[PDB]
Each structure stands twice: as structure tokens, then as C-alpha cells.
Design a protein around this ligand. Structure first.
Ligand SMILES: [Mg+2]
Ligand SMILES: [Mg+2]
Ligand SMILES: [Mg+2]
Ligand SMILES: [Mg+2]
Ligand SMILES: [Mg+2]
Ligand SMILES: [Mg+2]
Ligand SMILES: [Mg+2]
Ligand SMILES: [Mg+2]
Ligand SMILES: [Mg+2]
Ligand SMILES: [Mg+2]
Ligand SMILES: [Mg+2]
Ligand SMILES: [Mg+2]
Ligand SMILES: [Mg+2]
Ligand SMILES: [Mg+2]
Ligand SMILES: [Mg+2]
Ligand SMILES: [Mg+2]
Ligand SMILES: [Mg+2]
Ligand SMILES: [Mg+2]
Ligand SMILES: [Mg+2]
Ligand SMILES: [Mg+2]
Ligand SMILES: [Mg+2]
Ligand SMILES: [Mg+2]
Ligand SMILES: [Mg+2]
Ligand SMILES: [Mg+2]
Ligand SMILES: [Mg+2]
Ligand SMILES: [Mg+2]
Ligand SMILES: [Mg+2]
Ligand SMILES: [Mg+2]
Ligand SMILES: [Mg+2]
Ligand SMILES: [Mg+2]
Ligand SMILES: [Mg+2]
Ligand SMILES: [Mg+2]
Ligand SMILES: [Mg+2]
Ligand SMILES: [Mg+2]
Ligand SMILES: [Mg+2]
Ligand SMILES: [Mg+2]
Ligand SMILES: [Mg+2]
Ligand SMILES: [Zn+2]
Lengths: 116, 66, 76, 177, 136, 52
RNA sequence: CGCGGGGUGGAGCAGCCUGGUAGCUCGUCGGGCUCAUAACCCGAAGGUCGUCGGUUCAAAUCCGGCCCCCGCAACCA
RNA sequence: CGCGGGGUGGAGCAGCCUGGUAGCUCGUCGGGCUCAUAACCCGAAGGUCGUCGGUUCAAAUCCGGCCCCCGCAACCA
RNA sequence: UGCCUGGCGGCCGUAGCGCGGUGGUCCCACCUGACCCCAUGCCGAACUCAGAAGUGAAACGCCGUAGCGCCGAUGGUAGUGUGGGGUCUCCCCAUGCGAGAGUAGGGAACUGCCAGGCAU
RNA sequence: CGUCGUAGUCCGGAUUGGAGUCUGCAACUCGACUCCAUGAAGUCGGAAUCGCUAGUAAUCGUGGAUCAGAAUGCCACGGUG
RNA sequence: UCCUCCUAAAGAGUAACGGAGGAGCACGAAGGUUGGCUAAUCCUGGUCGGACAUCAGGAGGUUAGUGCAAUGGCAUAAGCCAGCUUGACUGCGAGCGUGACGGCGCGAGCAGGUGCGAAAGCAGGUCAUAGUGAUCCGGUGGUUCUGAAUGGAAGGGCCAUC
RNA sequence: CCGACUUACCAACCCGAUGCAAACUGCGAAUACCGGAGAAUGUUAUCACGGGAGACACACGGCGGGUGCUAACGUCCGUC
């Protein structure tokens, strides 16, 4: 029920950023894992896919789905975003509230290259 | 948890008629004195005698005989 | 015979259609209903009115999980 | 939480032996406790409302929430949005310990006890039975209460059927019959 | 006296009933009446034809009716102009549907059916025809 | 006509005042807010003034 | 829009007259008494003294903010 | 033919003032007293607000159809 | 290069409801503590954070079923002028124009990117 | 002498249910007494009003006759005042 | 005068006397930027509580709700709670239908901002649409415009208001 | 007091069926309204401005509303 409730909770924000057409930094946390991307303004193509399911990220972090791993993923994804040349995004908390793993990962992205 | 609005909540020591001391939490704190619990309750042996309906033929015969 | 009223009709309904140019600032539709919405490159006002931010030959389509009629924009 | 310990240690094994569910957690689970009191006199005196709320807060480990009038009713003479009902909802360790308190204190203390109905399951296993007084409870003092209230414990289960709810409660030694 | 318990509104437009109709086929009963033309069936007329069919069948069988005087027409009480707003509610009818079965009969022979439907023609000003339920 | 009209004058000394109403029968407390004045082009606190 | 009169238990009437003070006819009940509705008296209940604030030992009094009725010359775009 | 009012214990009126408060009297039931009755005084009971529907949480109370009466208007050649 | 699993575009009920079965390598959530960051107009119930003892009960995913809603047949169809008429409260002649109604007939999807387990 | 303190109280035993004795052949229409319990209203009483001056109103008791037994009753005697 | 629907020919609008229901606003919180939730209805059980107050499962999803009369809108929901607020600020700007005009029903954007959020995003009062009425002048307060000889000040003049 | 049984009665509600519209459109329209890419045509029949007008009292043949009586050399009507 959590997934459907969260998707309905996030429909307004996700459609808002899709229609605004500013490329949005997307998150979706789970208790055990998490996947972090950078998605196109309309949503038809991603830019960088970095997650705690990757080999190096998984083996360099003691626990996959925890806030410390979320912060490490934020650092890594924003630095790879700088490497590819990503500068401007408009945040999308994806229906959650801006606190916890999402807040720490977002602060990591701010430090490591994304302006928000 | 709200530590302010709710009353005090801690372990107590409570005793019953059958002497069983329950290491359970209560809202009062001080020791509690009860009367009957579910162990000494007459739910398994007293309920059938609670019917006490008796028999009219039995009472007639016992009171007197022809 | 006491009930013969009607509105001072407000002249609602689609005014500037798909296939008509949008001058800088122009609306597409005036309506009291969101029967035709703000899809791609379009916006809304205060009193159920929607004025498009983007010019050119307008695009009519139907979208939404609710089978809704929108107003989108082409490349003119 | 001796009831929690019993549930996690011996009750789970007993119900495994009973039901033979190939899934370990397929057994229905009790997941909350609800204690209700209905006061019509809220409109007459919000002050007695507050007194009853304080009594409920004393008897339960948590202060009750005051609900409002969902929809206005003419025959009951209460206005919509005016608070008319009170409730408490508990979980987990609170559930286990307060349930032990119930079974080992209130049940004998119920005046004229004759056993509780076995068909009190709300049709799907939700045990629902009422007691008329507040003095049958060990924290609500007899000598300090001026007006006696009532309450009905109603406990929602995840049982697919009233049969499995009754199996759970009888295995847990619930006082039905 | 067939007449609604309540109507949507007290009056309604005079209305239109042109073209082809939809009550072409028979639905409930064995024997029916067709009206190819166009007109109106008053509530008094519908009740009268029902009573007359009861008379003829001697309470053998059942009667069925499809159209209803759900439309309270406003005619104008005599000697009042076109003006002064719309007229006043006066009575109830249903109009004539080309192909419609109006009254239905069963349990009695075809001869008695055509007799009673000619008597419907003699208690109504409407053009008639004798119909029965269709095979599929 | 029960909601009396009130002119809202600034406390910054400038006499550009707005105007709304208030219902003294139901809400009698003074209408206290922060409000803008255009002459100083900055934000200050308004206090209600009688229409006079 | 301003002045003035005022809001007195249940009502109306005494005290705002430059702080130190709940009275009058009836309204209710109880008491004596006449057959007594009636009368006279005794007593009891009934008053943020329109509302809040400011000086203060001292308020209803002095003034300010708000509400209610009326008397007012005036104009009612 | 249209504009208003009214229909509330066994009877006559309020409450219709913009909705939650079943009020007054006569009358009937149980009394005391009376030579008996009346009067008198003391204890009780009695209602789906003409009706059928609608708004309203809820109506007598705001609105439409139905019944009757009280009134007025129901016109000019 | 293929199944399962997740993050997002193409269709927005031929997708959608239902019933018969399958998944814990990777994997979702259930789940251990919730003293913590953080929440309750009562409860870590909800969210959440430090963890992986177990988990597939509800859920998610996949196949089968045309039992429902839907798609649309082809004949057939009223009506719109247009010129002609009558049996003129409404019907017909030459065409362009043409709805619905349903039906014999289909569809549970289909499609794409990136990656994790799994093996060339 | 011990206990109670203005309340529905150990006031008040009322309404009632679980069981005996007698009398009466035969206790139910249509007997009381009794063991237990249920534990009411009633807080001096309304209008209007009766009998009592001295052993007097009252109040605590006894007896009788009625009668197999079934009264507070009606009638005689006493305690107190 | 001003409001909700069909009418009036599937843009538009279209009649009085072509059927039904109304207003002369109110909310400084019923608000907004930003944090949340999603109805109505019926069966089952329970001391109160009865069909319905309240609590506990289940069936449907906008048939609930709109601040009004109501239509059309609305799930992302303007429908149902609330931290900061008073965008219920102000000086300007390219632009549609009714349009005699008046303009009203319609504004990308300049700026000081405030208010808000980490930020996207905004706030351009409230679901829009009933709550409204001309000039002139005068009561009005913030504004040196003329300045009846020169230096000043007055009447009639712009913001907001009856 | 819970009650035992049945009874040419009414129908909630779902299925096998009947429905319906000025104030409903899970259907869909036509000529076309709005338009945007072409053959020819049309003495420029379109737009701006300046001088002056009438009428604000159009009827009958081919359509849908109230009407009205599904009447009329009928009407407010929208119309060739
Ligand atoms: Mg027809
Ligand atoms: Mg009343
Ligand atoms: Mg009153
Ligand atoms: Mg008596
Ligand atoms: Mg008498
Ligand atoms: Mg399966
Ligand atoms: Mg969880
Ligand atoms: Mg499962
Ligand atoms: Mg067809
Ligand atoms: Mg079709
Ligand atoms: Mg399918
Ligand atoms: Mg399926
Ligand atoms: Mg007493
Ligand atoms: Mg008493
Ligand atoms: Mg006693
Ligand atoms: Mg006893
Ligand atoms: Mg004797
Ligand atoms: Mg139209
Ligand atoms: Mg048209
Ligand atoms: Mg929000
Ligand atoms: Mg119920
Ligand atoms: Mg509203
Ligand atoms: Mg809103
Ligand atoms: Mg609003
Ligand atoms: Mg000067
Ligand atoms: Mg000078
Ligand atoms: Mg001069
Ligand atoms: Mg139709
Ligand atoms: Mg329709
Ligand atoms: Mg002409
Ligand atoms: Mg004309
Ligand atoms: Mg015609
Ligand atoms: Mg039509
Ligand atoms: Mg016509
Ligand atoms: Mg004519
Ligand atoms: Mg004609
Ligand atoms: Mg014509
Ligand atoms: Zn014990």
C-alpha cells in the first residue's frame, strides 16, 4: 500500500516538473536499498544511474540501505554529474518529505555539484 | 513518544489472592492490591454450578416419599 | 409566469483556435470550465481561465488517465 | 511484555501445530486495542467532557483523543463538528501489557460475570464486548469518581475468518467459553 | 388512472415525437396493438382501454402498457391569449409512436384479441393494427 | 451591511491607506497585521483607522 | 459623521452631581391572619451596578476603547 | 381568475418576527368541603402544529401542490 | 543474448475487473531496537532512522480463461442542405453527407531506456 | 452501658423470590405466624378540615369476644404523661 | 441592476410573458506560498446508542464536498486539518471575446520587495460565475499643481474614501 | 418475554426483461464554425479614413422551441 499511496502523493510534483521541463534529480529510497538517477525534463531518457546496487558503491559501503550510503551515493552521483557536465536541476523529492536519507543525500548532491 | 501529556508509565508490583506477583507496567506506580484474577476465577469449575437449576422430581423425592 | 431568467451570457467557449496564430500575450480559450487544460507550454489564471504562454499553431489532443481534453503546443 | 514473550515463544508454536500453515507468518495477528466511551452530555457540559477525558487518560496509558461530530443529526440534538465521542488506540507492548491487565484484573471484577459472547467478532474476527462500569478497573478509583462511565473493548484482528480468530483467542485462552 | 407520483418538473415543453419510433417490437404479452400514425393517448384513454380489456377478458390473463403520461402537458383553458406567459397545467398524455405496442393481452384467443383491439380503435381516435410477439 | 468598512493606514507615517471591512458583531478585535506602503517602498505594520 | 440623555436584580423608578453607601412599586416563594383572589407587615433568593482598560486604600461616579435605544440644525452625490 | 392571511390537546388563542424554548384559559380525571349539588380551593392526564412533498442537522416557523374559509381585486368599450 | 526486480518515456480501460497457479540468487515490503535525526490535535499506529533472525499471509510481478466493461463489424439507419412533390400536426423523389444502435467477430496487453542476480 | 449521626440511614419494613409449624378431613380461588434475602416511597404533607380541659389527646402494653385457626379491628383493663 | 441551467441552427449569442432556485456579500481566517488526508452510502458487533451521535471489519470511488441558488470544474483535487504569513503589497509592461464605446471577464514580463520554503516554485486573496449603481462636486486624509506685482500661503487639482 | 408455523398481499435489491427526456450524453454526428497547405474564377465584392442617408414598424415558399388545440394569410422567434 505504501508504493501506491506514495505514487499518488507524488503525482502532482512529478507531473509538475515533467510539464515544467526542467531536468529533475529523482530519488526513491527503500529500507534495504535505493536507486538514484538524473532524468530528462520530459522523462524519456536518464543521464546518470548510480545506486547502492552498483559493484563499487555496494562494496565500499557497509550497509546498502542506510542514510550514510545515501550520502555517499549523493556525493558520487553529483560528482559524476559534474564529470558529464550537469549544472542546473530543479529538485523533486518524489513525494517524500525533505528529511532523513533524502535530506542527507540531497545535501551530498549540493556539496558535490548540483545547485539547489 | 509524548513524555509530557501522558501520565506516568512504569513497572509496578501487584499481588492477587493466589499470591502471583505480576511484574507488569501500570500508570499508578505504587503497589496494587486486587481481589480475584483469572487464575483463581471460578470460570472453569463454578460456572456449571452457577446454573443451580436443580430438579423438581429430585426435590420432591428427597423432601418426602410415597 | 415568474421564472424567465438567464445569464447575461459571458461569451465563453473556445475563441482562438488551433491553427490560428497567437500574438504576443494572446489567449487560446476563454471558458468557465477546465474542459481544455494547460498541457505543454500553457498556463492558468485565477477564475478558471487559461492563457497559453507559447505561440504558434496550437495542438488539440486528449490525454490523462481520466480521458481529459487538453490544449498543447506544436513547433511553429 | 510477558504476553509479548508468550506470543513470540509458545503461542506461535501452538498455532503452528494447530493450523499447519506452510508460511510462518500466515497466522492472523491482533494489531490494536480500542476502548470506547460515548458521552452525549458533551454539549451540556464540556467540563464533564474534560473530566471524563481525564478519567480515560488515567485508566489508559495514553490520553484519549476527542473526536468531532462526523455528520449532523437532528434526533440526537448535537451539532456537526462538536466533539461527541472519545477513543484510545494502542499498539505493541502497550497492547500486550494492557491486555494482560484486562484479562487478569477486569474480567473477575466484572459484576455478575457470566462469560462473554463468542459471536462478538464483528463478522470477521474483531472481538467486541462491553462492560458497564469504570470501577471494575484498578486505576480508576472508586472513592474519587462521582459519575460512573462505561466502555466496550473492541479489538480488530487480521483474521480471514471468525473461525481462525476464535482459534487464535482460544489458543491464547480468551475467556469466551 | 396512470399518472406519475412525482414528475421531474411541473411543466415541460410541448415536445416533438417525429420520425421513426423505438417501441417497434413486443415485449411482455402475446397480443398487441400497433399504431402506425401519430397522435396522443390521454391518461383517461389508457385507463379506459385497460378497463375495457379487463371487461372482455373477464379477468383472464394480464394487461401490459408501455407508454406513460409522464409528461403533464399545459394546454390553455379556453378564452386566454397566447401571451400571459406559458399556459396552465391541464392534463396528462403520451404521444403515438410508429410501431409501438400500446396494450397487451394473453390467455385468450386471437379472435378475442383482435376484437378487443378494434374496441381500442373504438375507444381511441388512433389508427391500429394487430400484432403478436415476434420469434427472436 | 453589518461588516463595517475600515481604512488601514500605515504606522510608517505615510498616508497611503487601503480599505477592507470587519464585522464588529462577530470579530471585534483590532485588525493587526504587517502591511506595505508604496511611498517608502518597504514593509511596515498597519493599524486600523476609522473611516470617519 | 458629532453632541446629549441614558443601559440600575425580572421590569421600570432611586445612587454617576467630582471616590469611602444595592433603596422604592410591583415579579416569586415562605410566614401571621381573615372563607379569602384581595389587604398590611416580616423574611429569603435575585444585580460582571451595558463591556474592557487607565489614577488609586477607596468606584457606578473621573476619562478612554466597543455595543444597544432615543432626542437632535443639517445634507442624503 | 390573481394578490394576502389562517388552519397547533376535547374548544378558543399564542409561540409565526425569521428555526432547537409544547405556553394561556376553559374543559375532563382524583380529591377536601357541602345536609346533597353548584361555586371554591388542592392534586393529574391530554397534541404527526390542516394536509401531501421539498430546503434545512433539524420547521409550525423557509418553499411548491391539495381542502376550506376570511378579505380584496376579478377591468374599458 | 533471456527470465525475475527496481528507477522513468510511447497507448491512457483491445491497458482496465475477475478466477485457476508461480518468486526469494537479485529483489520489495512484512519484520528486530526505535534510547537517536525526525511524528502524533492518543499510540515509531503513519512516516522514519541503526539492521537482516525469518518472511511471501496482504501486496507486487508473470502465464491461462474471453466470465465482465471496451473496440469496431458488413448489411442497415434517421436526419442536413440541395432542386421536385404530396397523402402538409407529418411523409416521400436524383445525388453529395451520413449518425447511432448493436451483432456474427478481437484484445488480459503491447513498447522503450538504464542497471542488479543469474550464462554464453 | 457499647454503636450510629440528618442521609432514604440497622429510620421505614414496604413490593417480592428460595424453605417450615399449626389449624382445618380438605390452605388454591378465599389463613396467619416464621428463616433468609429484595431493601420502595415517605423527609410532618396540599386544599379544606375531624375528635380532645385532666387522668384529658396521644403513646407502650394486657385481656376478651369473634374463632379450629385467619386483624391494626370493636369492647373492658392497665404503664407513662 | 446584478446571478444557476436547456434556448438558439453540436464556436458564439440570441426573446419577453419559452420551466425551476437567488444577492446588495462574508472568511484576517473558510486565506495564500508551503507540510498532510480523501468521500457518500449499507451489512456485522458492542454498556450507553434507537435507522442514524461514538467505536471497531467489510462493499463502491467522486454517486461526498463545495460559503451560498446552481451549473460547469475539480483526485494533482479549489473537497477534508495546519507551522510562516498578511500576495486580502505597490509603482509599471507587449496581448483576446463582448465589444457604440466605455471597458469589463483575460496579462509573458521591469522592479523594491515582503511572505514562504533547502530548493523547484510561487503567492497576482478565497473553485470562477449572484454580493451591485454615471458625471460632477463635496466630507475626507497621504501630493507644493497653478501660484491674480515680488517672497510666502490659500481655493479648484493626483494616491485612497464615502 | 424470546416465540412455532403459512399467506392468490406490497415491493427494497440483483438477475431475465420495458423504459425515457428543455433542463443527463460512459455514443457519435452532418452541412459547416474556426481555421491552416491549392485549379480556375471573380471590372477589388477586404481594410483605413472623411461628406451625407434611411429605417430601431419587413410579409409569404423550403427548418426546430414556448406557443397554440402536435390549428392558422398565427407568433417572440434563430433562418435561406
Ligand atoms: Mg420519439
Ligand atoms: Mg419547538
Ligand atoms: Mg427563541
Ligand atoms: Mg387518591
Ligand atoms: Mg358544586
Ligand atoms: Mg498468483
Ligand atoms: Mg513497516
Ligand atoms: Mg501473497
Ligand atoms: Mg449505423
Ligand atoms: Mg455504432
Ligand atoms: Mg482483456
Ligand atoms: Mg485478470
Ligand atoms: Mg431519608
Ligand atoms: Mg425519596
Ligand atoms: Mg431497613
Ligand atoms: Mg431475611
Ligand atoms: Mg382465633
Ligand atoms: Mg449553444
Ligand atoms: Mg446555431
Ligand atoms: Mg499541498
Ligand atoms: Mg446498527
Ligand atoms: Mg461557495
Ligand atoms: Mg483553496
Ligand atoms: Mg475558498
Ligand atoms: Mg510654487
Ligand atoms: Mg505672488
Ligand atoms: Mg490673489
Ligand atoms: Mg432525446
Ligand atoms: Mg437530454
Ligand atoms: Mg429579405
Ligand atoms: Mg417583427
Ligand atoms: Mg417549419
Ligand atoms: Mg429539440
Ligand atoms: Mg415555432
Ligand atoms: Mg404567419
Ligand atoms: Mg403557422
Ligand atoms: Mg422564414
Ligand atoms: Zn488470584
Amino acid at each position: 500500500d505504501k508504493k501506491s499511496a506514495r505514487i499518488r502523493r507524488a503525482t502532482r510534483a512529478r507531473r509538475k516538473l515533467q510539464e515544467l521541463g526542467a531536468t529533475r534529480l529523482v530519488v526513491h529510497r527503500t529500507p534495504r536499498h535505493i536507486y538514484a538517477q538524473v532524468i530528462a525534463p520530459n522523462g524519456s531518457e536518464v543521464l546518470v544511474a548510480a545506486s547502492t546496487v552498483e559493484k563499487a558503491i555496494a562494496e565500499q559501503l557497509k550497509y546498502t540501505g542506510n542514510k550514510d550510503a545515501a550520502a555517499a551515493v549523493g556525493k558520487a552521483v553529483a560528482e559524476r554529474a559534474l564529470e558529464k557536465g550537469i549544472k542546473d536541476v530543479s529538485f523533486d523529492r518524489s513525494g517524500f518529505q525533505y528529511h532523513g536519507r533524502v535530506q542527507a543525500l540531497a545535501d551530498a548532491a549540493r556539496e558535490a555539484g548540483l545547485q539547489f | 513518544m509524548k513524555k509530557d501529556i501522558h501520565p506516568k508509565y512504569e513497572e509496578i508490583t501487584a499481588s492477587c489472592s493466589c499470591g502471583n506477583v505480576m511484574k507488569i507496567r501500570s500508570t499508578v506506580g505504587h503497589d496494587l492490591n486486587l481481589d480475584v484474577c483469572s487464575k483463581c476465577h471460578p470460570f472453569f469449575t463454578g460456572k456449571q454450578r452457577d446454573v443451580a437449576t436443580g430438579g423438581r422430581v429430585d426435590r420432591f423425592n428427597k423432601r418426602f416419599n410415597i | 409566469t415568474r421564472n424567465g431568467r438567464d445569464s447575461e451570457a459571458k461569451r465563453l467557449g473556445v475563441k482562438r483556435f488551433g491553427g490560428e496564430s497567437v500574438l504576443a500575450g494572446s489567449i487560446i480559450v476563454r471558458q468557465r470550465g477546465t474542459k481544455f487544460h494547460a498541457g505543454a507550454n500553457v498556463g492558468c489564471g485565477r477564475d478558471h481561465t487559461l492563457f497559453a504562454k507559447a505561440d504558434g499553431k496550437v495542438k488539440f489532443e486528449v490525454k490523462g488517465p481520466k480521458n481529459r481534453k487538453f490544449i498543447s503546443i506544436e513547433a511553429e | 511484555a510477558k504476553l509479548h514473550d508468550y506470543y513470540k515463544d509458545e503461542v506461535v508454536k501452538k498455532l503452528m501445530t494447530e493450523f499447519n500453515y506452510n508460511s510462518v507468518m500466515q497466522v492472523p495477528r491482533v494489531e490494536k486495542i480500542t476502548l470506547n466511551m460515548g458521552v452525549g452530555e458533551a454539549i451540556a457540559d464540556k467540563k464533564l467532557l474534560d473530566n471524563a477525558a481525564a478519567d480515560l487518560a488515567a485508566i489508559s496509558g495514553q490520553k484519549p483523543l476527542i473526536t468531532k461530530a462526523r455528520k449532523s443529526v437532528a434526533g440526537f440534538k448535537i451539532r456537526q463538528g462538536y466533539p461527541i465521542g472519545c477513543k484510545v488506540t494502542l499498539r505493541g507492548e502497550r497492547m500486550w501489557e494492557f491486555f494482560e491487565r484486562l484479562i487478569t484484573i477486569a474480567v473477575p471484577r466484572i459484576r455478575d460475570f457470566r462469560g462473554l459472547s463468542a459471536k462478538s467478532f464483528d463478522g470477521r474476527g474483531n472481538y467486541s464486548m462491553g462492560v458497564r462500569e469504570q470501577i471494575i478497573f484498578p486505576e480508576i478509583d472508586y472513592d474519587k469518581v462521582d459519575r460512573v462511565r462505561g466502555l466496550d473493548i473492541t479489538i480488530t484482528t487480521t483474521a480471514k475468518s471468525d473461525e481462525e480468530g476464535r482459534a487464535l483467542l482460544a489458543a491464547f485462552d480468551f475467556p469466551f467459553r | 388512472m396512470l399518472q406519475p407520483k412525482r414528475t421531474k418538473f411541473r411543466k415541460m415543453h410541448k415536445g416533438r415525437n417525429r420520425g421513426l419510433a423505438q417501441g417497434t417490437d413486443v415485449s411482455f404479452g402475446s397480443f398487441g396493438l400497433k399504431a402506425v400514425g401519430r397522435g396522443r393517448l390521454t391518461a383517461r384513454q389508457i385507463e379506459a382501454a385497460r378497463r375495457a380489456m379487463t371487461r372482455a377478458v373477464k379477468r383472464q390473463g394480464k394487461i401490459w402498457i408501455r407508454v406513460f403520461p409522464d409528461k403533464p402537458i399545459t394546454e390553455k383553458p379556453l378564452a386566454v391569449r397566447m401571451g400571459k406567459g406559458k399556459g396552465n397545467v391541464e392534463y396528462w398524455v403520451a404521444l403515438i409512436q410508429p410501431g409501438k405496442v400500446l396494450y397487451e393481452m394473453d390467455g385468450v384467443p386471437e379472435e378475442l384479441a383482435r376484437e378487443a383491439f378494434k374496441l381500442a380503435a373504438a375507444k381511441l381516435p388512433i389508427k391500429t393494427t394487430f400484432v403478436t410477439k415476434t420469434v427472436m | 451591511g453589518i461588516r463595517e468598512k475600515i481604512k488601514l493606514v500605515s504606522s510608517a507615517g505615510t498616508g497611503h491607506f487601503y480599505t477592507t471591512t470587519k464585522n464588529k458583531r462577530t470579530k471585534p478585535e483590532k485588525l493587526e497585521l504587517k502591511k506595505f506602503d508604496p511611498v517608502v517602498r518597504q514593509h511596515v505594520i498597519y493599524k486600523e483607522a476609522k473611516i470617519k
